[PDB]
Design a protein around this motif. Structure first.
Motif, PDB file in Angstrom:
ATOM      1  N   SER A 189       1.443  48.546   0.797  1.00  0.00           N
ATOM      2  CA  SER A 189       1.716  48.682   2.858  1.00  0.00           C
ATOM      3  C   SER A 189       0.960  47.939   2.832  1.00  0.00           C
ATOM      4  CB  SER A 189       2.381  49.536   3.657  1.00  0.00           C
ATOM      5  OG  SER A 189       0.842  50.227   3.343  1.00  0.00           O
TER       6      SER A 189
ATOM      7  N   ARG B   4       3.430  51.408   6.813  1.00  0.00           N
ATOM      8  CA  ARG B   4       4.706  51.596   6.937  1.00  0.00           C
ATOM      9  C   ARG B   4       4.276  53.295   6.024  1.00  0.00           C
ATOM     10  NH1 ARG B   4       5.276  48.670   2.469  1.00  0.00           N
ATOM     11  NH2 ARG B   4       5.790  46.854   4.199  1.00  0.00           N
TER      12      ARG B   4
ATOM     13  N   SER C  14       9.958  51.540   8.001  1.00  0.00           N
ATOM     14  CA  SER C  14      10.643  50.221   8.988  1.00  0.00           C
ATOM     15  C   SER C  14       9.357  49.495   8.890  1.00  0.00           C
ATOM     16  CB  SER C  14      12.280  50.442   9.676  1.00  0.00           C
ATOM     17  OG  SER C  14      11.679  49.882  10.922  1.00  0.00           O
ATOM     18  N   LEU C  15       8.322  49.860   8.600  1.00  0.00           N
ATOM     19  CA  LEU C  15       7.538  48.280   8.966  1.00  0.00           C
ATOM     20  C   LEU C  15       7.345  47.703   7.696  1.00  0.00           C
ATOM     21  CD1 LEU C  15       3.792  50.773  10.293  1.00  0.00           C
ATOM     22  CD2 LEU C  15       6.422  49.802  11.989  1.00  0.00           C
TER      23      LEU C  15
ATOM     24  N   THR D  49       6.260  55.592   3.854  1.00  0.00           N
ATOM     25  CA  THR D  49       7.996  55.670   3.905  1.00  0.00           C
ATOM     26  C   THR D  49       8.862  57.363   2.875  1.00  0.00           C
ATOM     27  OG1 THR D  49       9.867  54.275   2.212  1.00  0.00           O
ATOM     28  CG2 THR D  49       7.302  54.366   2.254  1.00  0.00           C
TER      29      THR D  49
END
Lengths: 551, 114
Positions: free
Chosen positions: A144, A468, A495-496, A470
């Motif tokens: 990310s 993000r 969902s970033l 997850t």
């Protein structure tokens, strides 16, 4: 009527939209609910829905969460009862979104490093004084670009300077990177790895110095008892200060001692002998003497031979002890902390390297701990953490300079687990977090596994920049530990985007989903390109060269 | 706790407005344990009870009360705490050997091993 709020809850706003194209936009957009001027309520959008009446065109449902109300350009959090069944809905203008973030913090104290994800044009400035003086936690899963954000904040930290003078500003930056990631991100920084940095073993406290040399699993209370004793007497003889201070000197007290004479003390106690007087008599070329607290300093020397025909009480119980220290004192990987230069180094030179006031004064100090052995990684990261805290403690005493200790992969130093190998760094980082805010020593927990970090350390940080996230266990850990929340924006974490961050806390005006600015020089770590090397031909001359170095 | 029995030397940490007296008749007559690591200010808290017990005087007289506290301090930490107290270090204190019993007298003089 054309587009009207049909459900006004204090936490959720549910409005009616006949057609979206005439209404104008996505999830997380800002909404204004005011058909009356001079006052408005700003609501972020949670989700869309479609309800079909089966007799007319379908009506698009827009569920919104009121983040607060704006009066004459000033944003106030909360949901007023001024909302009525006759209200109107339309998307918020760019200038009203700007007024949420711009008007809350003054121009001098603005610290911008990102922009809103929904609208690039609006930039979000965080309150720089409240962001940096308080502890920061930057957690985001792998891939990310979490280290890009930790970089881009720090590049903006050095570039943030007073207008009066241009150059090296007041701040000091210390980064504990294991991946060697920030070398390329800050090329003008001062980088210290194992090959150059020389920590002193004597600056370790009682908790730190035990685990560097021993292990709690294979050492009993009697085995360690001489080890606290042997260092303690060695501290007093090498203490060159006033005699009115030396009585407070103990094993926990950070004063210089010679480890090699302590090894000889343990080795001689391994060969202790009892005489006919039942006393540990001792022989050397200088004279003949018995073992006592006054005459224990001449026991520290190597050239001491035991005399007597009967063994001592503690005889033979230290051969496993001394060989454990014997392996570490010539361990070539531990040369940076038990080497010859560690005896010759001073406390002034030790703090001159970590703070980096040497020949090249730089804002950013990088302590590359990649080469540090993993069994002692939690000790060097603990010794330096205490040293900057002690520097921060005594900086205000000589003044009666904020330092950011960036902890890359902070869960490796300060875990939720209570294992003794991470014991030294966890309690020292707590002292950075719980106490060091008022001494100017502030930290930055950067980790790709936030759930491994202990809750006490993690919660103290109050500004939460998140990329993000997850892993479901990581998400439940962070969302439970939040100081503030807005309904459907914590669920946006997995969902970033790439480089798109969630930043909350008392420094920022409102929780929002931001896009961190792209790094011109990204923190890329130089690694062994396996498939590039494995595609090449079989290297055969290089095997013989390695073994000669090994031998 | 009765009014003549109250012995307050502290206040509640969560609410400093309220004072917390103890049953001082039941505080000192049964044995007390003060426990805490170094740097915790335990010597300050140990001393604070002893000043307040010394200052606990009946209003009918001005002078010394019947306080008798004997301190076995090994770190020399309360010499400056109580200026009216008597400090007996080694060159001033005098301990007779004949008042030791045979259990102490065997340990002080000889060693049974040799």
């Amino acid at each position: 009527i054309n587009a009207e709020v049909v459900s006004v809850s204090p936490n959720k706003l549910k409005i009616s939209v006949d057609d979206l194209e005439e209404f104008k936009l996505g999830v997380g957009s800002y909404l204004r609910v005011s058909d009356n001027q001079d006052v408005a309520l700003l609501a972020i959008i949670d989700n869309f829905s479609i309800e079909v009446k089966e007799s007319q065109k379908q009506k698009y449902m827009i569920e919104a969460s009121p983040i607060g109300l704006v009066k004459n350009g000033k944003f106030y959090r909360g949901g007023d009862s001024l909302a009525l069944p006759p209200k109107k809905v339309e998307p918020a203008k760019l200038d009203e979104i700007i007024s949420i973030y711009s008007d809350s913090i003054d121009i001098n104290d603005r610290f911008t490093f990102s922009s809103l994800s929904l609208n690039t044009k609006v930039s979000v400035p965080v309150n720089g004084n409240r962001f940096f003086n308080k502890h920061i936690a930057i957690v985001g899963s792998t891939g990310s670009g979490k280290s890009h954000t930790v970089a881009k904040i720090l590049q903006k930290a050095v570039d943030e300077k007073q207008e009066g003078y241009k150059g090296l500003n007041n701040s000091h930056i210390i980064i504990f990177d294991i991946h060697s990631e920030y070398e390329n991100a800050f090329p003008n920084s001062n980088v210290l790895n194992v090959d150059t940095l020389t920590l002193p073993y004597w600056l370790l406290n009682g908790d730190e110095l035990e685990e560097l040399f021993l292990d709690t699993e294979a050492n009993d209370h009697n085995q360690r008892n001489v080890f606290r004793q042997a260092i303690t007497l060695n501290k007093k003889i090498h203490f060159q200060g006033d005699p009115a201070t030396k009585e407070i000197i103990s094993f926990h007290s950070p004063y210089y001692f010679d480890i090699n004479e302590v090894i000889n003390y343990i080795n001689n106690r391994n060969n202790e002998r009892k005489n006919k007087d039942n006393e540990h008599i001792w022989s050397d070329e200088e004279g003949n003497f018995k073992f006592d607290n006054e005459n224990a300093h001449r026991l520290f020397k190597e050239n001491v031979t035991p005399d007597g025909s009967s063994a001592g009480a503690l005889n033979g119980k230290l051969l496993n002890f001394v060989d454990r220290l014997q392996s570490k004192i010539f361990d070539k990987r531990l040369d940076f902390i038990l080497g010859e230069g560690s005896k010759s180094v001073t406390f002034k030179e030790t703090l001159e390297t970590l703070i980096s006031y040497g020949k090249d004064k730089s804002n950013i100090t990088i302590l590359d701990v990649s080469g540090v052995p993993f069994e002692v990684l939690s000790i060097c990261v603990s010794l330096i953490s205490r040293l900057i805290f002690e520097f921060g403690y005594h900086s205000k005493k000589i003044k009666r300079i904020p330092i950011l200790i960036v902890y890359e992969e902070a869960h490796k130093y300060a875990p939720k687990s209570d294992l003794s190998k991470y014991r030294t760094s966890k309690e020292a980082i707590e002292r950075i977090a719980k106490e060091g805010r008022k001494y100017g020593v502030t930290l930055l927990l950067a980790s790709q596994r936030p759930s491994e970090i202990s809750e006490t350390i993690f919660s103290q940080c109050n500004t939460f920049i998140s990329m993000r996230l997850t892993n479901p266990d990581d998400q439940n850990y962070v969302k439970r530990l939040l100081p503030d929340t807005v309904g459907d924006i914590t669920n946006l974490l997995p969902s970033l985007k790439e480089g798109e961050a969630l930043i909350m806390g008392d420094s920022i005006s409102i929780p929002s989903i931001v896009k961190i600015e792209k790094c011109t020089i990204p923190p890329s770590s130089i690694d062994i390109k396996y498939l590039d090397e494995w595609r090449k031909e079989w290297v055969d001359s290089e095997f013989d060269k390695i073994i000669e170095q090994w031998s």
